[PDB]
Nucleic acid binder design. Structure first.
Lengths: 131, 199, 224, 165
RNA sequence: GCGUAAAGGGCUCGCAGGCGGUUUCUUAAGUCUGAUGUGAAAGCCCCCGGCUCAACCGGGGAGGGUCAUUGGAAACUGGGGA
């Protein structure tokens, strides 16, 4: 198995994103790490505390969505398909949602956000898209 | 060649009595036609489409070709859609002519504008759809200015536009800017021109 | 302010069949049921005391809703000596949801009641007072308690999370507030003020309808 | 929630008054059925109706349906917050956010619903079913799912007006 | 899109092909960005001017490439080593 890691994490935050669970697991990797700092710093989940140990893993985030159904993780989509890769230039870095959501394009200086990557003005692999 | 209609029943079933501003068929407020005295009903989205396009287009009277080219040509400008179409489709040389207190009829001021008479900008303007931008001296063509129509329209009063500026003695004119786009407040609702001509 | 030692006679309900929703407050399972969580019942009882009192002092009627056998003494005595006009019989279909035709049933109860001293007997033959007295005899015994709600029921103290399910849907119809003691094998998110405790013990019914009815009763006459 | 009371001027456009007949012993008992949606002209635009014996009867049960429900539709000045492809019931709707003078370009049930529910420029071209009830259903779910930017900053705690453009 | 509407190969083993666990050093082959060349004119779009205006003409721009040559970033796919 293991078709794509970022799709496993996105399916984790999605399926737990509708389950109404307090904490959520993940496979601990550099994409779950840097995507945990980006997606946690933008204010969707409460806190990622990467409780590492032998042999590999393992991240553990909490859903920062209150009483109101559908919190800061309101819907996620694989904008980049590992298998048929997305791409985005500088002027073509698309900001997902329009005014609500935010996309995460893996820039050439770190896994940026949408508006910050447009602040650098350089695109890359479209890493994921959180509508 | 637009100058063909009756000019009573076209406003009478066109939707609103203009212009005007009393020639709306006040003797019979219904629509014209043989089956017209009875109860009228509302249309579909093509009902407000044809009432918006035929209503807003009947205020000037142009053909559907030139009015359509003013539809897309108006949409080529800046600003909003119906505002740009509204300032475009009323800022013509004949609407600027009969809007400056030139003639007491839209067709009469039209033929007074393309009869060779109302020459503007210092020269002649012999095409009734050959307009003038904000700042052209929309003149009176003083080689035949001693006329009955021009003197009688200069005697008849009317609310001159603040986008324009008249001259009853000096034989001149002007348009200060674009007209009051939302300010020109007839019944012609530009949304029906944004729908019944957009597909 | 629930009697904490007195609450130790009304904690317990069905077990081995409890849903995941109304089992988050479960303390533990020791061989017969899940032991319901005590301190959650206490703090929730305080939420019913303050919110039921202060919201009950706005002036609206409280619907003492009750279904089960031996659940009519706590609601008929509790509300009938409390200040609400509830229904502890078999539930009427669409109680708040009808809101007019239940009113016309109030009209039949009105002419049936006021026709008792209205010379209803001694006009027609014995079949008139016999069949009609059977009519109020089989009408007042089903739908008399709604006479304490001439406006809409502003709140629904429902005492049965399973038997009163059509009531929970009826108050789900409007935006009305429906707080109630829902058992361990119930659905949590349907009610707005959970009383997470059992209802099997009749003393639990007297503590629930006594805390509720006494809450609205003592909170309401304190204007003077 | 919350159920908005009938406390404004309703528009009461009729979507379509379809025929209906229950094939019973004796022909077909024909009864009119009309799902006509009432609109508040500011955002309360709700669309459900019923059946009755006459055409005015279907108007009456339809108006009772409009007094049943209402929606919010938060949209800042001739748009929606996020132009989401909103369709539920096997009938899609593709309503994007449009500019100021770009008009309400929608279809039958979309042009009725958004046309009587306060729209200024929202481009809409459907992709899916074409029943009337399916159109008001998926359009009502899509209008009842589109998010507002101030509340979207006020419930996901990042910052209000921190996502601008 | 594929249980019943058209659509799961009867089922398996396998070469080619397509895709792939976590950490770390290098690389630029992809990925992205800067500089030059070149993508002729006329045409599409933007900005003006000339035929009474318009169609039209003219001027001033723009945009168009897995494009070459060349400078960077190494996050991600890949090459290589642990």
């Amino acid at each position: 198995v293991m078709t794509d890691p970022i799709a496993d994490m996105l399916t984790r935050i999605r399926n737990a994103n509708m389950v109404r669970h307090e904490k959520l697991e993940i496979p601990a990797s550099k994409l779950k790490r840097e995507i945990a700092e980006i997606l946690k710093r933008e204010g969707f989940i409460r806190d990622v505390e990467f409780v590492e140990d032998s042999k590999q893993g393992i991240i553990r985030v909490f859903l920062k969505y209150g009483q109101n159904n559908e919190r800061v993780i309101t819907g996620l989509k694989r904008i980049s398909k590992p298998g048929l890769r997305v791409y985005a230039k500088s002027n073509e870095v698309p900001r997902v949602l329009n005014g609500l959501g935010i996309a995460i394009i893996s820039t050439s200086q770190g896994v940026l956000t949408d508006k910050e990557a447009r602040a650098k003005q350089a695109g890359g692999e479209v890493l994921a898209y959180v509508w | 060649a637009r100058y063909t209609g009756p000019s009573w029943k076209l406003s009478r079933r066109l939707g609103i009595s203009l212009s005007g501003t009393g020639k709306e068929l006040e003797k019979r407020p219904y629509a014209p036609g043989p089956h017209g005295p009875g109860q009228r009903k509302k249309l579909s989205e093509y009902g407000l489409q044809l009432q918006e396009k035929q209503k807003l287009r009947h205020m000037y009277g142009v053909n559907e070709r030139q009015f359509r080219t003013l539809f897309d040509k108006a949409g080529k400008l800046a600003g909003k859609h119906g505002e740009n179409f509204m300032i475009l489709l009323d800022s013509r040389l004949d609407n600027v002519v009969y809007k400056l207190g030139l003639a007491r009829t839209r067709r009469q001021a039209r033929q007074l504008v393309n009869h060779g008479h109302i020459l503007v900008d210092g020269s002649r303007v012999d095409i009734p759809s050959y307009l003038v931008k904000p700042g052209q001296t929309i003149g009176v063509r003083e080689k035949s200015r001693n006329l009955s129509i021009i003197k009688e329209s200069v005697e008849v009063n009317n609310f001159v536009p603040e986008y324009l500026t008249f001259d009853a003695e000096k034989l001149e004119g002007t348009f200060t800017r674009l007209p009051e786009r939302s300010e020109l407040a007839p019944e012609i609702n530009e949304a029906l021109i944004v729908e019944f001509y957009s597909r | 302010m629930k009697q904490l030692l007195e609450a130790g006679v009304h904690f317990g309900h069905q077990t081995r069949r409890w849903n995941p929703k109304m089992k988050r407050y479960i303390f533990t399972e020791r061989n017969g049921i899940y032991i319901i969580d005590l301190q959650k019942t206490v703090k929730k009882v305080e939420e019913a005391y303050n919110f039921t009192k202060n919201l009950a002092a706005e002036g609206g009627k409280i619907l003492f809703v009750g279904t089960k056998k031996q659940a009519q003494d706590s609601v008929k005595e509790e509300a009938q000596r409390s200040g609400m006009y509830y229904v502890n019989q078999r539930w009427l279909g669409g109680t708040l949801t009808n809101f007019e035709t239940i009113q016309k049933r109030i009209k039949r109860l009105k002419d049936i009641e006021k026709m008792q001293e209205n010379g209803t007997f001694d006009v027609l033959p014995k079949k008139e007072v016999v069949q009609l007295k059977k009519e109020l005899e089989r009408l007042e015994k089903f739908l008399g308690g709604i006479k304490d709600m001439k406006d809409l029921p502003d709140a629904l103290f429902i005492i049965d999370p399973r038997k009163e399910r059509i009531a929970v849907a009826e108050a789900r119809k409007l935006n009305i507030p429906i707080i109630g003691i829902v058992d361990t094998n119930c659905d949590p998110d349907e009610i707005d003020v959970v009383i997470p405790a059992n209802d099997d013990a009749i003393r639990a019914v007297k503590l629930l309808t006594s805390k509720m009815a006494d809450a609205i009763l003592e909170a309401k006459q304190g204007e003077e | 929630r919350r159920i908005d009371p009938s406390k404004l001027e309703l528009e009461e456009r009729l979507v379509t008054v379809n025929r209906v007949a229950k094939v019973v012993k004796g022909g077909r008992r024909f009864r009119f059925a009309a799902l006509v949606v009432v609109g508040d002209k500011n955002g309360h635009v709700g669309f459900g109706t019923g059946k009755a014996q006459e055409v005015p009867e279907a108007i009456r049960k339809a108006v009772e349906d409009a007094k049943k429900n209402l929606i919010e539709v938060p949209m800042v000045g001739t748009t929606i917050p996020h132009e989401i492809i909103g369709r539920f019931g096997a009938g899609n709707i593709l309503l994007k956010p449009a500019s100021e003078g770009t008009g309400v370009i929608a279809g039958g049930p979309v042009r009725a619903v958004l046309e009587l529910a306060g729209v200024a420029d929202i481009l809409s071209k459907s992709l899916g079913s074409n029943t009337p009830i399916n159109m008001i259903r998926a359009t009502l779910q899509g209008l009842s799912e589109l998010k507002r930017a101030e509340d979207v900053a006020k419930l996901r705690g990042k910052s209000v007006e921190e996502l601008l453009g």
